C-alpha cells in the first residue's frame, strides 16, 4: 500500500532520519570522539544509500568538522588535494589520452585475436591483464584504462538476457581485478606504501618487509583470489559461427589501419609513466629519487610531469622539411591532448570522493577517535590471536567498503600498531591483514574509485555488485587467514614474538 | 618570409626557449631564491604566452618545487585546495544553479526593462550592479553569475562591426567591474581579509582598520575608478525603433512566464548565501562565527553548506496531499541541481589555476625569495616616500597580472611589512596600496579568474583586454596615489609616523 510511497521518497527520508538515528552516538562516547564518529557514520550511510551524490557527501567534512570543533577549515580543506589525488588525476588524464586516440580499440582487438570469442576466456584474460597492470600502477588508473578496452570488446563481439548478463559481469570484472592486483606489490597501491611508512615510523627496528618479501608473500594471494573471483564472476554471469566471428574481428582490426604517430606517442608516454613510477624508489635497489632531497619526490610529481608532456607534444610527425618548404601551409599542430577534452573526460567526482576520504581520516586521528578505538579493543586479549586477527580483518574489509582504501588504512593502521604491542603479539601479524583487507572494496561504488569508474558506464546495478562483493569479501578474508596461518609466519618470521 | 613560419610554431618555441632565457636568473641570486624566481618567471611567461594551457602551467610547481628542493611534494600539493578554492568552487556551483533554472534570463529581462535598449546604459548598469554584487561576494563568483545575465542580454537586444565590437565591450565590462567591486569592502575579496589578518599578526597594536574605515576609504575609489572604466569601455566599444524593441523585450518577458518554484528556491538560496557570507564575521559587530571555536569557521564552510542544499532540495512544490493521494504517480522528484550538470558546468581549470597561485606563493615565502626581495629594496630610502609608494603599487599592479590576486597579495604583503618598518614610514601607507592594487588584474585571462570566465565565452581576444587593461591599470595606480595623498592620511591617520 504505502510501501511504494515511502520507497519513492527514499532520498529525503534517509537524509532527515540518519542524523536522528545517529544522535545517540554523540552521547555514547566522549564529545570530540562522539562527534567524529557521528560524522563518519553519517558519511558512510549517505554514501551507501545514495542519499546525496558521492561528491556532495564527500564535501560533508568541510561543513561538519569546523562546526563541531574537530578540525579548523584551514586544516580539513587542504586534505582534498594531498599528492595521492594528483597521482590519481594524472592517471585519469593518461587514460583519457589513451581513449582519445583509439589506442584502446587497438589493444582490445589484439586481445580478441590472442584470446578468441569466448566470454569466459576474455573475462579471465582481462582479469590477469588488469592485475598485471595494477601491480605497477594504481587501481584507479588501471581501471580507468581498462574500462575503455572492455567497452570496445563488448561493442566488438556483440556488435537476449545472456548478452546483458555478460555486460554486467564483463564490466564488474575490471574494478574488482584492479583491487585484487593492487595488493601484491608495494608499488601496486597506496596502502602498501602507507604500511611501509607507518612501519618505518612506528618500528625502526623492524625492517624484514621489503619489495621482495611482500611480493613473494602476496603474489600467491593474487593468484588464489583472482581465480576465486574469476570463477565467481563466470558462474554468476555466463555460467562455423566462431570462424565468422573471428573473420569479423580480423576485418575490424584491418579497418583500424596502421598505427598512427599519436598512438605510438601516447603508448610510449604510458610506458615511461609506468617505468618511472616503478623505478622512482624501489626498496631493494634505490631509485632516481635518491638523486634529490629525501621525501621531496613522490608519485604525484612523476604523474604530473608525464601528463604535462601530453598537452604540448605534437600529434603528427614533425618533419624538418617544413621549415624549408615555404609552400607548406602555416597551421598550428594539434597536441596529443587538449585541456578541453581532458576536462570533459576527467571524473572530478572521484577526486572529490578521495578528498573526502582523506579529510574524514585526518578528522579521525585528530579528534582522538582512533586512540579511543584502540583503547576499546583492550578486552580482546583472552581471545586467541588467530580468530582475533580473523575478526580484525573482517571488520577492516567490511569498513573499507564505505571510504577509500587509503582513508581506511590511514585510520586503522596506527590503531593496529598500538593494539599489537598492547597484546604482546607480532606487529606484522596485524599490520599486513589490515593493509591487504582494506583493498577488498567490493560492495558499493564509493568503496574504491575503480567501482565508481565501473558505474560510470551505467550497465551495473548496486544490488549486483553487492551480491558479488559479499562472497568476494568472504573469500578474501578466508585467504588472508590462510596466508596468516601457513606461509606468513615463515616469510616475515612473524610466528614468534 | 620566415616570420609566418616562426609565428606558426609560437608554442613550442616559447616552451623550449623560456627556461634557457631564464637560466641566468638561477645563477644571479642565491640558489633556492634563484630556483624559486626561475619557477615564478617561467610560470608567468607560460601563462602570458599561452605556451601551455592555464591548468597545465598551474601544475608546474608540483614538478618544479620538489625537483629543485624548494618544497616537498607533500607540502606543495595541499596548497591547491586551500579553503579559498572551496569558496570559489561553491560560488561557481551556485552560479551554475542560477543559470540552469533560467533565472539569469529573468534578471536580464528585468534589467532591460528598468534600463532600456541602450548599450552605454546597459554597460553602466551592469558595471554598478556587478560592483554591488562584488562588495559582498567574491569577484570570481559575481563574474560567474553575471556573464550568464550579460549573454542573455546580448541575445535579447541583438536577437555589422558595431554589433561585434559591442559584444567585445559588453563582455569585457563584467570581470573588470567585479575586480573593481572587490576592493571597497573587506568581505568583498580575499586579499582584504589577508591584509587584515596579516596586520593582526604583524601589528597587534595597529587596529585602526575596520569595516567602516576601509569602506569609507575605498568606496570613493570604487566610484571614481568605475566611472573611469565605464568611460574607457564606452569609448573603446560603442563610442519608432526603440518602441518596437521595448515591445519585443516585454513580449520576451511575458514568454518567460510566471516564476517557477525552482527559480524562487535558487534565488532564496542565493540570498542566504550572500547574507551568511557577510554576517559570518563582520569586524564592527561580531557574527555567528563567534558561537563556535575561533578560527575554525571560514567562508568555505558557508559556501559548501549552502551548495549542499542545492543537491537535495526539490525543484517542485512539495504537497502533503501526495502522501494521502494513493492515485498519484510514484516518481522521484528532480533536485535543484544534479551533480552531473554541475560537473559539466564547473570550470575546474579555474580551480587548478588558483591552486597553482597558492602553491607558487608558498614556494615564494618558503624559499626565502620574499625575504630576499625585501632585503633588495633597502636602497629605496633616499627616494621620497610618495613616489616610492607610487612605484611600489605600479610593480604590484603589474605583477598581479600573472598570478591571482590572492597569490600576489600573500607574496608581497610581508615584504611590504618589513619594508615599511625598515624605512620608518607608516605601515598602512604601504599595506593598503598593495592590497588594493593586487585586485587590478586586467591584462591577461590568468590575471584573475573573472578574466578566464570572460574568455569562457570566446568573443574576447587577448589583444583587446591587453589594450584596455593598460589604461585601466594606469588609472588605478593614479587613483591609488590620489587616495594615498589626499584622504588616506586622515581616515587611517597614516600621514604621521
Ligand atoms: C542509518 C541506519 C540505516 C543504520 C542504523 C543507525 C543507527 C540507528 C544505529 C547504528 C549504531 C547504533 C548505536 C550502537 C550502540 C549504542 C550504544 C548504546 O549504549 C546506546 C545506543 C547506541 C548509541 C546505538 C544507537 C543507534 C545507532 C546509532
Ligand atoms: C556493523 C553494523 C552491525 C553496524 C554499522 C556500523 C556502526 C554504526 C557500528 C558498528 C559497531 C558499533 C559500536 C559498537 C559498540 C559501541 C560501544 C558503546 O559503548 C557505544 C557505541 C559503540 C561505539 C557502537 C557505535 C556504532 C558502531 C560503530
Ligand atoms: C601467439 C600468436 C598466435 C599471437 C601473437 C601474440 C600477441 C597477440 C600478444 C603477445 C603479447 C601480447 C601483449 C602483452 C601485454 C600487453 C599489455 C596490456 O596492457 C595490453 C595488451 C598487451 C599489449 C598484449 C597484446 C597482445 C600481445 C601482443
Ligand atoms: C626508459 C625510460 C622510461 C626512462 C627511465 C630509465 C630508468 C631505468 C633510469 C632513469 C634514471 C636512472 C637512475 C639514475 C641514478 C641512479 C643512482 C645510482 O646510484 C644508481 C642507479 C640509479 C638509481 C638509476 C637507475 C635507473 C634509472 C631509474
Ligand atoms: C627543437 C628546435 C629545432 C626548435 C623547435 C622546433 C619546433 C617548434 C618545430 C620542429 C618541427 C616542426 C613541425 C614540422 C612539421 C609540421 C607539420 C605542419 O603542419 C606544421 C606543424 C608541424 C607539426 C611542425 C610544428 C613545429 C615543429 C615541431
Ligand atoms: C567508524 C570508524 C571510524 C571505525 C570503525 C567502527 C568502530 C568504531 C567499531 C567497530 C567494532 C567496534 C567494537 C566491537 C566490539 C567491542 C567489544 C566491547 O568492548 C564493546 C566495544 C568494542 C571494542 C567496539 C568498539 C567500537 C568498534 C571498534
Ligand atoms: C621569456 C621572455 C619572453 C622575456 C625575457 C626573459 C629573459 C630573457 C630575461 C628576463 C630578466 C633577465 C635577467 C635580468 C637581470 C639579470 C642580472 C644580470 O646580472 C645577469 C642577467 C640577468 C640574470 C637577466 C638574464 C635574462 C633575463 C632572465
Ligand atoms: C618588468 C619587465 C621589464 C621584466 C619582467 C619581470 C622579471 C623577469 C624581471 C623584473 C625585474 C628583474 C630583476 C631586477 C634586478 C635584479 C637584480 C640582479 O642582481 C639579479 C636579477 C634581478 C633579480 C632581476 C631578475 C628579473 C626581474 C625579476
Ligand atoms: C521604476 C519602475 C519603472 C520599474 C520598477 C523597478 C525594477 C525594474 C527594479 C527595482 C529594483 C531592481 C533590482 C535591484 C537589485 C537587483 C539585484 C541584482 O543582483 C540583479 C537585479 C536586481 C534584482 C534588480 C532588478 C530590477 C529591479 C527589480
Ligand atoms: C536570513 C537568513 C539568511 C539567516 C541569517 C540570519 C542572520 C541575520 C543571523 C543568523 C545567526 C545570527 C547570529 C547568532 C548569534 C549571535 C551572537 C550574539 O552575541 C550577537 C548576535 C549574533 C552574532 C547573531 C547575529 C544575526 C545572525 C548572523
Ligand atoms: C519532513 C517529514 C514530513 C518527512 C519528509 C517528507 C518528504 C520526504 C516528502 C514531503 C512532501 C513530499 C513531496 C510531495 C509531492 C511531490 C510530487 C510527486 O511527484 C512526488 C515527489 C514530491 C516532490 C514529494 C517528495 C517527497 C516529499 C518532499
Ligand atoms: C617574481 C616575483 C616573485 C617578484 C616580483 C619581481 C621582483 C623579483 C623584482 C621586481 C622589481 C625588482 C627590483 C627593481 C630595482 C632594484 C634596485 C636595485 O637595488 C636592484 C635590485 C632591485 C631592488 C630589484 C630587485 C628585484 C625586484 C624586487
Ligand atoms: C549540537 C548537536 C551536535 C550533534 C548533532 C549534529 C547534527 C548535524 C547534522 C548535519 C546534517 C548534514 C546533512 C543534512
Ligand atoms: C560545542 C560547540 C559546537 C556546537 C554545535 C555542534 C553541531 C553543529 C552543527 C552544524 C550544522 C550545520 C549545517 C549546515
Ligand atoms: C621507428 C619508430 C618510430 C616511432 C615514432 C613515434 C615516437 C614517439 C616518441 C614519444 C616520446 C615522448 C616523450 C618525449
Ligand atoms: C640543474 C639546473 C637547475 C636550473 C634549471 C632548471 C630547468 C628546469 C626546466 C623545466 C621546464 C618545464 C617545462 C617544460
Ligand atoms: C641541487 C639539487 C637539484 C638539482 C636539479 C635541479 C633541477 C631539476 C629539474 C627537474 C625537471 C624535471 C622535468 C620533468
Ligand atoms: C509565497 C511565497 C512562496 C515561496 C515558495 C518558494 C520557497 C523556497 C524556499 C527555499 C528555502 C531554501 C533553504 C531551506
Ligand atoms: Na576501500
Ligand atoms: Na591577480
PDB file of C-alpha atoms in Angstrom, chain A residues 1-2 4-6 8-13 15-16 51-53 55-56 59-60 62-74 76-83 86 89 93 288 292-293 295-298 300-302 304-305 307-308 311-314 322-333 337-339 343-344 346-349 351-352, chain B residues 1-2 4-6 8-13 15-16 51-53 55-56 59-60 62-74 76-83 86 89 93 288 292-293 295-298 300-302 304-305 307-308 311-314 322-333 337-339 343-344 346-349 351-352:
ATOM      1  CA  UNK A   1       0.000   0.000   0.000  1.00  0.00           C
ATOM      2  CA  UNK A   2       2.130   2.857   1.338  1.00  0.00           C
ATOM      3  CA  UNK A   4       5.722   2.294  -2.666  1.00  0.00           C
ATOM      4  CA  UNK A   5       5.076   5.827  -1.392  1.00  0.00           C
ATOM      5  CA  UNK A   6       7.780   5.531   1.281  1.00  0.00           C
ATOM      6  CA  UNK A   8       9.556   6.722  -3.605  1.00  0.00           C
ATOM      7  CA  UNK A   9      10.912   9.294  -1.112  1.00  0.00           C
ATOM      8  CA  UNK A  10      13.952   7.234  -0.104  1.00  0.00           C
ATOM      9  CA  UNK A  11      16.445  10.092  -0.515  1.00  0.00           C
ATOM     10  CA  UNK A  12      14.932  12.744   1.747  1.00  0.00           C
ATOM     11  CA  UNK A  13      13.771  10.180   4.309  1.00  0.00           C
ATOM     12  CA  UNK A  15      18.741  12.380   4.713  1.00  0.00           C
ATOM     13  CA  UNK A  16      16.460  13.597   7.506  1.00  0.00           C
ATOM     14  CA  UNK A  51      21.028   9.996  -0.317  1.00  0.00           C
ATOM     15  CA  UNK A  52      23.419  12.628  -1.701  1.00  0.00           C
ATOM     16  CA  UNK A  53      25.759  12.471  -4.704  1.00  0.00           C
ATOM     17  CA  UNK A  55      30.899  14.224  -4.289  1.00  0.00           C
ATOM     18  CA  UNK A  56      28.370  16.091  -2.137  1.00  0.00           C
ATOM     19  CA  UNK A  59      32.201  17.533   1.000  1.00  0.00           C
ATOM     20  CA  UNK A  60      30.489  16.867   4.344  1.00  0.00           C
ATOM     21  CA  UNK A  62      34.147  20.808   5.323  1.00  0.00           C
ATOM     22  CA  UNK A  63      30.824  21.626   6.992  1.00  0.00           C
ATOM     23  CA  UNK A  64      30.835  19.153   9.884  1.00  0.00           C
ATOM     24  CA  UNK A  65      34.399  19.192  11.253  1.00  0.00           C
ATOM     25  CA  UNK A  66      34.690  23.005  11.692  1.00  0.00           C
ATOM     26  CA  UNK A  67      31.158  23.381  13.070  1.00  0.00           C
ATOM     27  CA  UNK A  68      31.693  20.540  15.560  1.00  0.00           C
ATOM     28  CA  UNK A  69      35.128  21.822  16.595  1.00  0.00           C
ATOM     29  CA  UNK A  70      37.025  18.791  15.297  1.00  0.00           C
ATOM     30  CA  UNK A  71      39.223  20.395  12.634  1.00  0.00           C
ATOM     31  CA  UNK A  72      39.608  24.011  11.502  1.00  0.00           C
ATOM     32  CA  UNK A  73      38.514  24.910   7.996  1.00  0.00           C
ATOM     33  CA  UNK A  74      42.126  25.701   7.075  1.00  0.00           C
ATOM     34  CA  UNK A  76      40.362  19.931   6.662  1.00  0.00           C
ATOM     35  CA  UNK A  77      40.323  21.832   3.357  1.00  0.00           C
ATOM     36  CA  UNK A  78      43.931  21.154   2.179  1.00  0.00           C
ATOM     37  CA  UNK A  79      43.389  17.326   2.718  1.00  0.00           C
ATOM     38  CA  UNK A  80      41.312  17.225  -0.503  1.00  0.00           C
ATOM     39  CA  UNK A  81      44.450  17.670  -2.603  1.00  0.00           C
ATOM     40  CA  UNK A  82      47.110  15.586  -0.899  1.00  0.00           C
ATOM     41  CA  UNK A  83      49.674  14.265  -3.505  1.00  0.00           C
ATOM     42  CA  UNK A  86      47.339  14.273  -8.065  1.00  0.00           C
ATOM     43  CA  UNK A  89      44.202  12.691 -11.515  1.00  0.00           C
ATOM     44  CA  UNK A  93      44.240  12.128 -17.723  1.00  0.00           C
ATOM     45  CA  UNK A 288      66.209   8.097  -9.086  1.00  0.00           C
ATOM     46  CA  UNK A 292      67.285  14.650  -4.897  1.00  0.00           C
ATOM     47  CA  UNK A 293      66.211  15.647  -1.396  1.00  0.00           C
ATOM     48  CA  UNK A 295      60.982  12.834   0.921  1.00  0.00           C
ATOM     49  CA  UNK A 296      60.620  15.677  -1.588  1.00  0.00           C
ATOM     50  CA  UNK A 297      59.639  13.467  -4.543  1.00  0.00           C
ATOM     51  CA  UNK A 298      56.585  11.228  -4.840  1.00  0.00           C
ATOM     52  CA  UNK A 300      52.400  12.687  -7.889  1.00  0.00           C
ATOM     53  CA  UNK A 301      55.399  14.585  -9.275  1.00  0.00           C
ATOM     54  CA  UNK A 302      56.089  11.815 -11.790  1.00  0.00           C
ATOM     55  CA  UNK A 304      52.101  15.425 -13.300  1.00  0.00           C
ATOM     56  CA  UNK A 305      55.398  15.614 -15.202  1.00  0.00           C
ATOM     57  CA  UNK A 307      50.866  14.328 -18.095  1.00  0.00           C
ATOM     58  CA  UNK A 308      52.336  17.769 -18.830  1.00  0.00           C
ATOM     59  CA  UNK A 311      49.469  18.848 -23.507  1.00  0.00           C
ATOM     60  CA  UNK A 312      52.256  20.118 -25.792  1.00  0.00           C
ATOM     61  CA  UNK A 313      53.589  17.049 -27.628  1.00  0.00           C
ATOM     62  CA  UNK A 314      52.516  17.163 -31.300  1.00  0.00           C
ATOM     63  CA  UNK A 322      58.521  22.020 -43.118  1.00  0.00           C
ATOM     64  CA  UNK A 323      60.868  24.879 -42.200  1.00  0.00           C
ATOM     65  CA  UNK A 324      62.485  24.839 -45.649  1.00  0.00           C
ATOM     66  CA  UNK A 325      59.227  24.229 -47.565  1.00  0.00           C
ATOM     67  CA  UNK A 326      57.836  27.749 -47.864  1.00  0.00           C
ATOM     68  CA  UNK A 327      54.839  26.399 -49.815  1.00  0.00           C
ATOM     69  CA  UNK A 328      53.604  24.283 -46.895  1.00  0.00           C
ATOM     70  CA  UNK A 329      50.514  25.673 -45.125  1.00  0.00           C
ATOM     71  CA  UNK A 330      51.196  27.504 -41.863  1.00  0.00           C
ATOM     72  CA  UNK A 331      48.704  25.875 -39.500  1.00  0.00           C
ATOM     73  CA  UNK A 332      49.181  25.110 -35.815  1.00  0.00           C
ATOM     74  CA  UNK A 333      49.745  21.446 -34.994  1.00  0.00           C
ATOM     75  CA  UNK A 337      45.637  16.115 -25.628  1.00  0.00           C
ATOM     76  CA  UNK A 338      43.868  19.456 -25.320  1.00  0.00           C
ATOM     77  CA  UNK A 339      42.739  20.620 -21.898  1.00  0.00           C
ATOM     78  CA  UNK A 343      38.295  18.410 -18.539  1.00  0.00           C
ATOM     79  CA  UNK A 344      35.346  16.793 -20.325  1.00  0.00           C
ATOM     80  CA  UNK A 346      38.204  13.586 -16.170  1.00  0.00           C
ATOM     81  CA  UNK A 347      35.907  12.315 -13.379  1.00  0.00           C
ATOM     82  CA  UNK A 348      36.343  15.143 -10.864  1.00  0.00           C
ATOM     83  CA  UNK A 349      33.734  13.422  -8.679  1.00  0.00           C
ATOM     84  CA  UNK A 351      38.852  13.360  -6.950  1.00  0.00           C
ATOM     85  CA  UNK A 352      36.368  14.929  -4.535  1.00  0.00           C
TER      86      UNK A 352
ATOM     87  CA  UNK B   1      59.263  35.446 -45.352  1.00  0.00           C
ATOM     88  CA  UNK B   2      60.065  33.142 -42.430  1.00  0.00           C
ATOM     89  CA  UNK B   4      54.990  33.425 -40.579  1.00  0.00           C
ATOM     90  CA  UNK B   5      56.826  30.117 -40.126  1.00  0.00           C
ATOM     91  CA  UNK B   6      58.274  31.195 -36.766  1.00  0.00           C
ATOM     92  CA  UNK B   8      53.257  29.393 -36.589  1.00  0.00           C
ATOM     93  CA  UNK B   9      55.373  27.475 -34.037  1.00  0.00           C
ATOM     94  CA  UNK B  10      54.950  30.028 -31.243  1.00  0.00           C
ATOM     95  CA  UNK B  11      54.003  27.461 -28.584  1.00  0.00           C
ATOM     96  CA  UNK B  12      56.962  25.082 -28.747  1.00  0.00           C
ATOM     97  CA  UNK B  13      59.444  27.894 -29.389  1.00  0.00           C
ATOM     98  CA  UNK B  15      58.269  26.410 -24.279  1.00  0.00           C
ATOM     99  CA  UNK B  16      61.825  25.433 -25.219  1.00  0.00           C
ATOM    100  CA  UNK B  51      52.505  28.138 -24.301  1.00  0.00           C
ATOM    101  CA  UNK B  52      50.671  25.612 -22.108  1.00  0.00           C
ATOM    102  CA  UNK B  53      47.026  25.523 -21.002  1.00  0.00           C
ATOM    103  CA  UNK B  55      45.747  24.496 -15.807  1.00  0.00           C
ATOM    104  CA  UNK B  56      48.879  22.743 -17.082  1.00  0.00           C
ATOM    105  CA  UNK B  59      50.553  22.338 -12.221  1.00  0.00           C
ATOM    106  CA  UNK B  60      54.185  23.366 -12.776  1.00  0.00           C
ATOM    107  CA  UNK B  62      54.229  20.123  -8.376  1.00  0.00           C
ATOM    108  CA  UNK B  63      57.080  19.216 -10.732  1.00  0.00           C
ATOM    109  CA  UNK B  64      59.450  22.137 -10.164  1.00  0.00           C
ATOM    110  CA  UNK B  65      59.420  22.764  -6.398  1.00  0.00           C
ATOM    111  CA  UNK B  66      60.176  19.148  -5.317  1.00  0.00           C
ATOM    112  CA  UNK B  67      62.780  18.598  -8.041  1.00  0.00           C
ATOM    113  CA  UNK B  68      64.545  21.872  -7.190  1.00  0.00           C
ATOM    114  CA  UNK B  69      64.403  21.210  -3.442  1.00  0.00           C
ATOM    115  CA  UNK B  70      62.150  24.175  -2.659  1.00  0.00           C
ATOM    116  CA  UNK B  71      59.081  22.406  -1.261  1.00  0.00           C
ATOM    117  CA  UNK B  72      58.329  18.720  -0.664  1.00  0.00           C
ATOM    118  CA  UNK B  73      55.598  17.102  -2.716  1.00  0.00           C
ATOM    119  CA  UNK B  74      53.526  16.601   0.443  1.00  0.00           C
ATOM    120  CA  UNK B  76      53.072  21.797  -2.477  1.00  0.00           C
ATOM    121  CA  UNK B  77      50.056  19.639  -3.455  1.00  0.00           C
ATOM    122  CA  UNK B  78      47.735  20.542  -0.480  1.00  0.00           C
ATOM    123  CA  UNK B  79      48.207  24.239  -1.467  1.00  0.00           C
ATOM    124  CA  UNK B  80      45.950  23.516  -4.489  1.00  0.00           C
ATOM    125  CA  UNK B  81      42.880  23.012  -2.283  1.00  0.00           C
ATOM    126  CA  UNK B  82      43.338  25.676   0.395  1.00  0.00           C
ATOM    127  CA  UNK B  83      39.859  26.901   1.686  1.00  0.00           C
ATOM    128  CA  UNK B  86      36.275  25.761  -1.906  1.00  0.00           C
ATOM    129  CA  UNK B  89      34.043  26.331  -6.258  1.00  0.00           C
ATOM    130  CA  UNK B  93      28.228  25.806  -8.443  1.00  0.00           C
ATOM    131  CA  UNK B 288      27.717  33.879  14.097  1.00  0.00           C
ATOM    132  CA  UNK B 292      31.979  28.332  17.662  1.00  0.00           C
ATOM    133  CA  UNK B 293      35.722  27.838  18.041  1.00  0.00           C
ATOM    134  CA  UNK B 295      39.431  30.363  13.514  1.00  0.00           C
ATOM    135  CA  UNK B 296      37.586  27.105  12.816  1.00  0.00           C
ATOM    136  CA  UNK B 297      34.950  28.634  10.517  1.00  0.00           C
ATOM    137  CA  UNK B 298      35.520  30.405   7.204  1.00  0.00           C
ATOM    138  CA  UNK B 300      34.404  27.947   2.552  1.00  0.00           C
ATOM    139  CA  UNK B 301      32.259  26.210   5.178  1.00  0.00           C
ATOM    140  CA  UNK B 302      29.353  28.562   4.474  1.00  0.00           C
ATOM    141  CA  UNK B 304      29.844  24.294   0.902  1.00  0.00           C
ATOM    142  CA  UNK B 305      26.909  24.173   3.330  1.00  0.00           C
ATOM    143  CA  UNK B 307      25.734  24.384  -2.068  1.00  0.00           C
ATOM    144  CA  UNK B 308      24.931  21.069  -0.362  1.00  0.00           C
ATOM    145  CA  UNK B 311      21.786  18.857  -4.422  1.00  0.00           C
ATOM    146  CA  UNK B 312      18.813  17.551  -2.408  1.00  0.00           C
ATOM    147  CA  UNK B 313      16.264  20.391  -2.338  1.00  0.00           C
ATOM    148  CA  UNK B 314      13.277  19.512  -4.564  1.00  0.00           C
ATOM    149  CA  UNK B 322       0.757  13.427  -2.214  1.00  0.00           C
ATOM    150  CA  UNK B 323       1.091  11.074   0.766  1.00  0.00           C
ATOM    151  CA  UNK B 324      -2.688  10.707   1.073  1.00  0.00           C
ATOM    152  CA  UNK B 325      -3.343  10.579  -2.696  1.00  0.00           C
ATOM    153  CA  UNK B 326      -2.690   6.921  -3.472  1.00  0.00           C
ATOM    154  CA  UNK B 327      -3.562   7.542  -7.140  1.00  0.00           C
ATOM    155  CA  UNK B 328      -0.670   9.970  -7.651  1.00  0.00           C
ATOM    156  CA  UNK B 329       2.258   8.549  -9.658  1.00  0.00           C
ATOM    157  CA  UNK B 330       5.241   7.409  -7.594  1.00  0.00           C
ATOM    158  CA  UNK B 331       8.136   9.114  -9.372  1.00  0.00           C
ATOM    159  CA  UNK B 332      11.274  10.560  -7.805  1.00  0.00           C
ATOM    160  CA  UNK B 333      11.388  14.351  -7.640  1.00  0.00           C
ATOM    161  CA  UNK B 337      20.896  20.700  -9.161  1.00  0.00           C
ATOM    162  CA  UNK B 338      22.225  17.276 -10.107  1.00  0.00           C
ATOM    163  CA  UNK B 339      25.936  16.599  -9.779  1.00  0.00           C
ATOM    164  CA  UNK B 343      30.393  18.812 -13.119  1.00  0.00           C
ATOM    165  CA  UNK B 344      29.625  19.728 -16.734  1.00  0.00           C
ATOM    166  CA  UNK B 346      32.036  23.928 -13.233  1.00  0.00           C
ATOM    167  CA  UNK B 347      35.298  25.380 -14.622  1.00  0.00           C
ATOM    168  CA  UNK B 348      37.802  23.107 -12.867  1.00  0.00           C
ATOM    169  CA  UNK B 349      40.564  24.857 -14.828  1.00  0.00           C
ATOM    170  CA  UNK B 351      40.288  25.831  -9.522  1.00  0.00           C
ATOM    171  CA  UNK B 352      43.611  24.420 -10.718  1.00  0.00           C
TER     172      UNK B 352
END
